[PDB]
Design a protein around this ligand. Structure first.
Ligand code: NI
Ligand code: NI
Ligand code: NI
Ligand code: NI
Ligand code: NI
Ligand code: NI
Lengths: 113, 70, 32, 70, 32, 113
């Protein structure tokens, strides 16, 4: 148990991309009870974005404290056609010290802009 | 996705479903303990906690079934 | 348009970008 | 590397070395069983097998120490 | 030149390329 | 135990990039006794390439049956200055159905060529 908490979080993430939204959500709520907020937030956002509920996923962007979640908000802005907001977010991520964030930003700008 | 969006899915794409069967058993075992404790009664705080835990476990079993179904 | 694709949020996003996204997802899960 | 070339290293970069301590104990436990079985005698085939296993475990403990040293 | 860098084989290789390499390494380890 | 076999393989790989060569090698030999050949081969190659023993790492390229190991041989050819061999290997990997292999090849060609 911690090994199982991690596996349930992984099942929820995998499931959030394969239409298992109710299941993913139950797991995210439980992860929050356990204090695994960043992982719960990732699952919630992935599940909402993968259902096309972009505006609700974007409610979490306000004051977002976890930079690794920023790409999801750029993707939401992209599907909502919010071009200028997308461009500002990508420009911000461009200077990230996390290479994955910086590469995600440069790559999406390149594919999208 | 076409090729595994997550590490768990790669683990599960292995020939002998050894990992999937093992994970399913662990989830079922945890869900049965959870239901047994709920049946004994639990205070209200523990009850809401256990119910959320049971639903998380049932959700995990449901996702696992979908990830491994032929 | 009623049949939703798996991982629809990155449908059409290229592998380089999705790989960076996967790297970030795994970094969050590995910290549990 | 600057930022973790492997999943295990990310797991180990966590504040409370809960994972590292746990992994170290499992490796030490397996190495002690291995040494106990070697001490009882083992046939020659099993002996070469056990020695390789003990060295793999000692190597794992040595890498873990280097990955987690402050 | 006697002090060898950690991960010297990819020293100077960019993050996009090393990320693809890490993806392949993890795919091998996850199949165990 | 299988969980521990995987963890030892991960320790060996992490260690192969941090000067723990003798340790990584002992683990690779044991993985081969257990039938985990592809993982053992990965560790052996990473350990040799990270020591600068490029020619010995390249002895495994001959008939290599695991495409995921091909990037390591391209890297070895690169450090040995074998430009034309490198270019042929990258051109071959370019058409791989594994996106990670194809992206590794396109990316290294772009950074190197
Ligand atoms: Ni609970
Ligand atoms: Ni129940
Ligand atoms: Ni439709
Ligand atoms: Ni053995
Ligand atoms: Ni010994
Ligand atoms: Ni020197």
């Amino acid at each position: 148990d911690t090994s199982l908490i991690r596996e349930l979080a992984e099942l929820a993430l995998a499931g959030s991309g394969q239409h298992c939204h109710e299941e993913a959500l139950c797991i995210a709520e439980w992860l929050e009870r356990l204090g695994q907020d960043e992982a719960a937030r990732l699952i919630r956002i992935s599940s909402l974005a993968n259902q096309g509920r972009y505006q609700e996923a974007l409610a979490f962007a306000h004051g977002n404290p976890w930079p690794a979640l920023e790409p999801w908000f750029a993707l939401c802005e992209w599907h909502l056609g919010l071009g200028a907001a997308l461009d500002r977010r990508l420009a911000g991520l461009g200077g990230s010290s996390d290479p994955a964030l910086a590469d995600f930003a440069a790559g999406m700008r390149a594919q999208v802009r | 996705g076409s090729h595994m969006m997550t590490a768990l899915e790669t683990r599960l794409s292995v020939a002998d479903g050894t990992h999937a069967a093992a994970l399913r058993q662990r989830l079922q075992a945890a869900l049965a303990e959870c239901r047994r404790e709920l049946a004994r009664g639990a205070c209200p705080e523990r009850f809401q906690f256990l119910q959320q835990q049971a639903r998380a476990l049932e959700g995990g079993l449901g996702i696992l079934s979908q990830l491994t179904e032929d | 348009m009623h049949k939703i694709n798996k991982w629809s949020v990155i449908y059409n996003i290229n592998s380089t970008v999705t790989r960076a996204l996967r790297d970030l997802m795994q970094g969050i899960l590995q910290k549990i």
